[PDB]
Design a protein around this ligand. Structure first.
Ligand SMILES: [K+]
Ligand SMILES: [Mg+2]
Ligand SMILES: [Mg+2]
Ligand SMILES: [Mg+2]
Ligand SMILES: [Mg+2]
Ligand SMILES: [Mg+2]
Lengths: 39, 131, 123, 109, 100, 58, 51
RNA sequence: ACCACGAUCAAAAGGGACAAGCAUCAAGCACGCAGCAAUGCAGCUCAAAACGCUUAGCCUAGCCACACCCCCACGGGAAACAGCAGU
């Protein structure tokens, strides 16, 4: 991209990072509903 | 308005003794018996006399504008008959665009000559749309 | 002023003689009558045999419609299209609420003695 | 202490003359891109009081801050016309010119 | 056909303009326990009582009709104090209107 | 000089030149035709540039 | 004093400009003389052919 | 100073500058000018991003905003630790 194009577009904009299963928290408290096994 | 058919051709108008000549040779040497290009040349010569300061200088921007204007008149006259001539439609539209460009340059460089051109050729200069 | 500009926006989303005639237009459009007065004045013309159609209009917010069971006498035995108005003013509780409203109108017609004949029916 | 207007002297091009005695002028400044460290033109519109209505679209003008604003957006007045559109006079030699060519030679005088 | 038993008959032009929604409705959710009262304007009221547990009440009405929650004991006094006026914006006209 | 308005003009006059507008309203014209860019710098520094002594006091 | 010096330098460059332009005028005169001779020859030939 | 000349400090007011995302927010709808006024002109912003929605205290010797809620607080809801300790 030319200098004019980079001036127009501006600095690169990193998308917001995706929240995981913990929604960005170290731990979470939960209540067990049922126990089972998976293969 | 077109030049009278009895007017002599541009090349046979300064030859000495052209007034001492028989009527038949005058007819042979007139716009009556020439194709349209000589009539357009006569129109161009008349406009050059009427508008520009130096009618002999043909490389000036005003001269080019006058030439393109007579060409545009020719294209409009042609398209008045051949309504479905797409090639000459393209040529007319283009020629109008470049005459607008030349008028813009003349306005930005020489306003007095620009006014004289716009009055002489009956051109109404219009500013381009913003969007 | 604020509501005026708001209704201007809604209109945007939608996209001597004249004076008194427009006044008559408003007055004639705004005419209203009672139910029994309707039965004794307007039903006669609407029960003339021929080719006809009724665009019955019902306000979605104001349901059930107590006028719906009375249509057989009001208009007669002719073709009827029910139009639920003011659907834009309804909050979207869940996806496909419009289908639920259409169905509910269908059962509301069914509860009354109205024949439901949607779509192609036969010769 | 001579005026309450921030921009005191500014040069611009006239882009509008549809107002009565007011010219809409375009003023360009050079702004440094903090990342690229290249200078780009930033444009700003100003309204200049033109008492005599002598502005034409395209001419380069100089504007002087008024002692106080005379209107909501009119804060400057036309001090002079630096370059009249199509009627430029070469400041160095004082002769009329058309673009880069002299309309009249300096030697004529 | 004119609807019988309609509030809009009783209300005046301005009050009808306020009550009738003109923009899309936004719901308003309120969790109520037994012994509480909901006021929709001065026109509607709901008393919740003898309930084994809490419940949720979602008001779908014009965005410019106030919804006010109170206890059962204070509901009557509040209604008399603020009938008309601005807390319960419909109807309007102070105590003169509420006579009719 | 971040607060000084610098503006450019192309092919409007037969000769190049610089023009300075001062706070008093005065105009200073500096013809730069036939001059080198370093000469232009030295000239403008000499006529309208703060001397080294003033910078040292600042 | 600095403004006076700037004016003096402008006048000096103006004198140099006059010198250069007088030179250019002289070579332009001789060039256009030659070109006008060529144009005169062409005009004579063309006009005689038309006669 | 204390008599103010005026310095320091700093409101209101005028000019300028001043975060991020989204154009699947592209038109805004009176946003301008001239005249002592009467009134006249039809203008103003905008793809160099107007108008709009969403997000976030900020540019930290510190600054801005708020002080239960109704932006505000005559009035009303209603009875207040976002002062310290504490629950
Ligand atoms: K607050
Ligand atoms: Mg202030
Ligand atoms: Mg926040
Ligand atoms: Mg408060
Ligand atoms: Mg505490
Ligand atoms: Mg608290």
């Amino acid at each position: 991209a030319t200098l004019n194009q980079m001036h127009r577009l501006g600095p690169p904009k990193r998308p917001p990072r995706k929240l995981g299963p913990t929604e960005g928290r170290p731990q979470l408290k939960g209540v067990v509903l049922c126990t089972f096994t998976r293969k | 308005d077109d030049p009278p058919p009895s007017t002599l051709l541009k090349d046979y108008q300064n030859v000495p003794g052209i007034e001492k000549v028989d009527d038949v040779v005058k007819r042979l040497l007139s716009l009556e018996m020439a194709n349209k290009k000589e009539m357009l040349k006569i129109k161009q010569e008349q406009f050059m006399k009427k508008i520009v300061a130096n009618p002999e200088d043909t490389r000036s921007l005003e001269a080019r504008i006058i030439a393109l204007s007579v060409k545009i008149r020719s294209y409009e006259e042609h398209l008045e008959k051949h309504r479905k001539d797409k090639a000459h439609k393209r040529y007319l539209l283009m020629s109008i665009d470049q005459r607008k460009k030349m008028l813009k340059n003349l306005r930005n460089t020489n306003y007095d000559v620009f006014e004289k051109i716009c009055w002489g050729l009956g051109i109404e200069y219009t500013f381009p749309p913003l969007y | 002023e604020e509501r005026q500009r708001q209704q201007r926006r809604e209109e945007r989303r939608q996209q001597c003689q004249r004076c008194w005639l427009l006044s008559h237009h408003r007055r004639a459009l705004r005419l209203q009558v009672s139910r029994e007065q309707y039965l004794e004045l307007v039903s006669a013309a609407l029960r003339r045999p021929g080719p006809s159609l009724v665009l019955y209009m019902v306000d979605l917010l104001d349901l059930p419609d107590a006028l719906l069971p009375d249509l057989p006498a009001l208009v007669g035995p002719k073709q009827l299209i029910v139009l639920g108005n003011k659907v834009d003013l309804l909050p979207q509780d869940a996806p496909g609420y419009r289908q639920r409203l259409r169905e509910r109108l269908w059962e509301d017609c069914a509860r009354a003695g109205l024949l439901l004949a949607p779509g192609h029916q036969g010769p | 202490v001579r005026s309450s207007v921030h921009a005191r002297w500014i040069v611009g091009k006239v882009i509008g003359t549809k107002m009565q005695k007011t010219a809409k002028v375009r003023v360009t400044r050079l702004v440094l891109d903090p990342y690229l460290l290249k200078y780009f033109n930033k444009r700003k519109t100003y309204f200049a009081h033109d008492a005599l209505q002598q502005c034409t679209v395209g001419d380069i003008v100089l504007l002087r801050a008024l002692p106080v604003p005379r209107a909501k957006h009119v804060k400057h007045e036309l001090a002079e016309i630096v370059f009249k559109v199509g009627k430029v006079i070469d400041p160095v030699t004082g002769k009329p010119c058309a673009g880069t060519t002299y309309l009249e030679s300096p030697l004529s005088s | 056909i004119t609807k019988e038993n309609c509030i809009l008959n009783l209300l005046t032009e301005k009050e009808v303009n306020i009550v009738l929604p003109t923009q899309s409705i936004v719901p308003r959710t309120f969790v109520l326990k037994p012994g509480m009262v909901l006021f929709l304007g001065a026109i509607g009221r709901i008393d919740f009582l003898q309930g084994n547990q809490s419940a949720w009440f979602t008001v779908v009405a014009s965005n410019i009709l106030p919804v006010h929650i109170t206890s059962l004991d204070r509901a009557d006094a509040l209604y008399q104090k603020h009938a008309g006026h601005t807390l319960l914006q419909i109807p309007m006209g102070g105590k003169e209107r509420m006579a009719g | 000089n971040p607060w000084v308005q610098i503006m450019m003009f192309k092919n409007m006059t037969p000769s190049p030149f610089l023009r300075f507008y001062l706070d008093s309203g005065e105009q200073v014209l500096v013809d730069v035709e036939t001059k080198s860019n370093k000469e232009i710098m030295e000239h403008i520094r000499k006529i309208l540039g703060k001397n080294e002594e003033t910078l040292r006091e600042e | 004093e600095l403004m006076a010096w700037n004016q003096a330098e402008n006048r000096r460059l103006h004198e140099l400009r006059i010198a250069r332009l007088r030179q250019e005028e002289r070579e332009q005169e001789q060039r256009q003389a030659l070109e006008q001779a060529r144009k005169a020859e062409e005009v004579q030939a063309w006009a005689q052919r038309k006669e």
